[PDB]
């Protein structure tokens, strides 16, 4: 008859919530990250169909926390602009977006003060009949970004700790929700750029097959629709001004950087080819129509909200600014290049954190950024018109949706190497997932050997991960030891197989079924078997002592 046999290193897994670590004086690519692995091993799991859900992927929330945590830490040692909150006597420089302001500054010696001046943008100034104050003075103290930092969105690779694995959905037309017949396993993600933006997603990944439109629920007009493009659209933005910096000493080793202007003033703007955009829009509308088969499609401007939403926000590698994209989110489009006007802020409120504020220093000389539009965020108007037309608008604001637009292909699971199966005996990477239980047993070492040390503000995470990996490893080894199966990969025991545990044919089990399928059926009695196995060894130990005593 059949007996219990223990297998260690079987290719099965379950959804898990763990912590991933960062693989590369940048603001994001900090010194605490590890070197990347230049050769990812995309092992194809043929005959394995995993189900993904980008809308419940904890990786996104983890990413969000990571980005913020780093940001805050990076600006920790930077100058706090406390003494800046003084009476501002301002005049003019009709592009009157810049005001020349004078104020009283406290010198190195507390007993002494003097006059000083700086150029500020109207957007950063609040009327207090020509006296003003800095906008932040009634909310919090803005921290001046350290003069020697880099805000370039250097791509970050996420890697799993030993015992865990990252699955990829390689189905180029996957909607981000459902089965992925085309699935592979990797140790790390690719390099994803921490691009902070709204409306139009820049410098992201392009679709590999076609334009894909995905959402949590198209029937829910309170949710955002994410569209990923296959063909990129070039957009170039520039700030054609002599923003000469000035160094103002505001304390004992604390320098404030003020803006100055040498020449004249021209508004910043973006340049996007009309013909290009038009084509992209037409293509997107077509795909939308497929979901909304008997209606017209119209693109309009933002319904309203904070500047950060109504306009296109992005970091041009320098000073942050916002552009008016009403010329793009439209139905009437010209072939000629479209110029979009923009405005610049010195005082920036990151994300949606109240009380958080940073001040950006001026960059001497002009700036020009060449970037690609890779996708965008749209929302649909509620209700329905007799005109049988649906209206879509730009939106965003929650950076999690930006991250979600890149990490949607990844899923994190934990490997459960210990399995039990019925056999006819009595005692005395992960590619095998697609193989049958029998054949899969020939790769137990290949898998098991990589479940311990595969790894060889981020510091604490790496340390925690290391400990966890050890705990799990030892736990399993302890069990194998107790059951008298130490050092074995396939261990036949002295416990008989139950009839209530399975009614499957032995041949089907080993020749047809895979370990994943088996687990889902036999797991019902996991603890039951373990208990019996422990009792068996106890019996054996006393029997050995009995014999030894002779």
């Amino acid at each position: 008859n059949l007996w219990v046999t223990v297998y260690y290193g079987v290719p099965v897994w379950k959804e898990a919530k763990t912590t991933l670590f960062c693989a590369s004086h940048n603001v994001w690519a900090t010194h605490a990250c590890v070197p990347t692995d230049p050769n990812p091993q995309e092992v194809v799991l043929e005959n394995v169909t995993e189900n993904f859900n980008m809308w419940k992927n904890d990786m996104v929330d983890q990413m969000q926390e990571d980005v913020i945590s780093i940001w805050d830490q990076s600006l920790k040692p930077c100058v706090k602009l406390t003494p800046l909150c003084v009476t501002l006597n301002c005049t003019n420089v009709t592009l009157g977006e810049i005001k020349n302001c004078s104020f009283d500054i406290t010198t190195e010696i507390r007993d002494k003060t003097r006059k000083e001046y700086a150029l500020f943008y109207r957007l950063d100034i609040v009327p207090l009949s020509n006296t003003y104050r800095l906008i932040n003075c009634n909310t919090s103290t803005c921290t001046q970004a350290c003069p020697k930092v880099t805000f370039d969105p250097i791509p970050i690779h996420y890697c799993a700790p030993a015992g865990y694995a990252i699955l990829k959905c390689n189905n180029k037309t996957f909607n981000g929700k459902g089965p992925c017949n085309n699935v592979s396993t990797v140790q790390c993600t690719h390099g994803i750029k921490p691009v902070v933006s709204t409306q139009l997603l820049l410098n992201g990944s392009l679709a590999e097959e076609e334009i894909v439109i995905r959402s949590k629920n198209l029937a829910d007009n309170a949710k955002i629709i994410i569209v990923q493009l296959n063909k990129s659209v070039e957009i170039v933005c520039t700030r054609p001004n002599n923003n000469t910096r000035r160094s103002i000493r505001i304390g004992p080793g604390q320098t404030f950087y003020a803006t100055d202007i040498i020449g004249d003033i021209r508004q910043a703007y973006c340049n996007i080819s009309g013909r290009n955009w038009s084509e992209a829009v037409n293509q997107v509308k077509k795909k939308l129509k497929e979901h909304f088969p008997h209606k017209n499609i119209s693109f309009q401007s933002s319904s309203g909200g904070d500047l950060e939403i109504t306009t296109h926000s992005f970091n041009c590698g320098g000073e942050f600014f916002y552009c008016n994209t009403s010329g793009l989110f439209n139905d009437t489009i010209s072939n000629a290049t479209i110029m979009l006007p923009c405005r610049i802020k010195q005082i920036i409120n990151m994300w949606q954190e109240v009380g958080k504020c940073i001040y950006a220093p001026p960059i001497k000389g002009n700036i020009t950024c060449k970037s690609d539009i890779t996708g965008l965020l749209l929302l649909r108007d509620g209700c329905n018109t007799a005109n049988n037309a649906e209206i879509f608008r730009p939106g965003g604001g929650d950076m999690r949706d930006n991250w979600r637009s890149e990490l949607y292909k990844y899923k994190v699971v934990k490997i459960e190497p210990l399995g039990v199966a019925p056999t006819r005996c009595k005692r005395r990477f992960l590619g095998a997932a697609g193989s049958t239980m029998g054949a899969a047993s020939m790769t137990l070492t290949v898998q098991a050997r990589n479940l311990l040390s595969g790894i060889v503000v981020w510091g604490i995470k790496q340390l925690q991960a290391r400990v966890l990996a050890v705990e799990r490893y030892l736990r399993d080894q302890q069990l194998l030891g107790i059951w008298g199966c130490s050092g074995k990969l396939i261990c036949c025991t002295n416990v008989p197989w139950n009839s209530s545990w399975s009614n499957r044919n032995l041949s089907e089990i080993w020749d047809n079924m895979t370990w994943l399928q088996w687990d889902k059926e036999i797991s019902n009695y996991t603890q039951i078997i373990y208990g019996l196995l422990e009792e068996s060894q106890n019996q054996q130990e006393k029997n050995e002592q009995d014999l030894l005593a002779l």
């Epitope: 029937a219 829910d220 007009n221 309170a222 319904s303 309203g304 909200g305 904070d306 950060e308 939403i309 949606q352 509620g382 209700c383 939106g395 604001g397 929650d398």
Partner: antibody, heavy 119, light 100 residues
Framework: QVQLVQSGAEVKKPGASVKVSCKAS????????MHWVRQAPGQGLEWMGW????????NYCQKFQGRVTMTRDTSISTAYMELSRLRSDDTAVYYC??????????????WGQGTLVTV | EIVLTQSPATLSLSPGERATLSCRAS??????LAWYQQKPGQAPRLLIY???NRATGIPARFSGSGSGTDFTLTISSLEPEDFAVYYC?????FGQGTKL
């Protein structure tokens, strides 16, 4: 507990505009979307739109586009709605409402007293 | 779009009895439904959500079920206090409701 407190009833002349406030308490103001819906005087309810206090983002019912606008002030946990070009058919009780869960926010578990506006 | 229809428009019922209220839609919405109680001069109150779950403070005798495009609210042990208007809701779409 939580509650929504709306302004009192108001009477305007046709063509004019009305402003209706709604103060929230008992929870994080920016935790959930605020919805506006009006109850017609002897008929079913008609959804107006909603606002997201985190960014002031809005979504208006198509039929009122260009007539209604919404905003907010987080410092006083108060939402605001305004309707211009008022008509006689706009007479209704405008309710301030909040959903139960941040995930499915259409479950309007929490309601204000409603504000009656006429011409 | 989604158009919700309920019936019977009105129901003259007595205490202790049982009755149900239908709700239909032209499109499948799985189970994302809600039912609201409406009394004269009062604010709307959530009764049932997900077409299965009772709202806070709602007695067990209030239930309902449905799927896809055909849903129904069920109320047992009817009371005089139930003589109100009940609405069927899906997303921003409100039905006409019925009166007991």
């Amino acid at each position: 507990q939580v509650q929504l407190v709306q302004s009192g009833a108001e009477v305007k002349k046709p063509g004019a505009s009305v402003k209706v406030s709604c103060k929230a308490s008992g929870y994080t103001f920016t935790g959930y979307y605020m919805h506006w819906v009006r109850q017609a005087p002897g008929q079913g309810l008609e959804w107006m739109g909603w606002i997201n206090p985190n960014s002031g983002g809005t979504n208006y019912c198509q039929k009122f586009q260009g007539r209604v606008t919404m905003t907010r002030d987080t410092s006083i946990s108060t939402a605001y709605m305004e309707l211009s070009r008022l008509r006689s058919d706009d007479t209704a009780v405008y309710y301030c409402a909040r959903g139960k869960n941040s995930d499915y926010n259409w479950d309007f578990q929490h309601w204000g007293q409603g504000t009656l506006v006429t011409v | 779009e989604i158009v919700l229809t309920q019936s019977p428009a009105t129901l003259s019922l007595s205490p202790g009895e049982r009755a149900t209220l239908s709700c239909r839609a032209s499109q499948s919405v799985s189970s994302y439904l809600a039912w609201y109680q409406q009394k004269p001069g009062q604010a709307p109150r959530l009764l049932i959500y997900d077409a299965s779950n009772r709202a806070t403070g709602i007695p067990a005798r209030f239930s309902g079920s449905g799927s896809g495009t055909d849903f129904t609210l069920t109320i047992s042990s009817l009371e005089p206090e139930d003589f109100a208007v009940y609405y069927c809701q899906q997303y921003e779409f409100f039905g006409q409701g019925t009166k007991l």
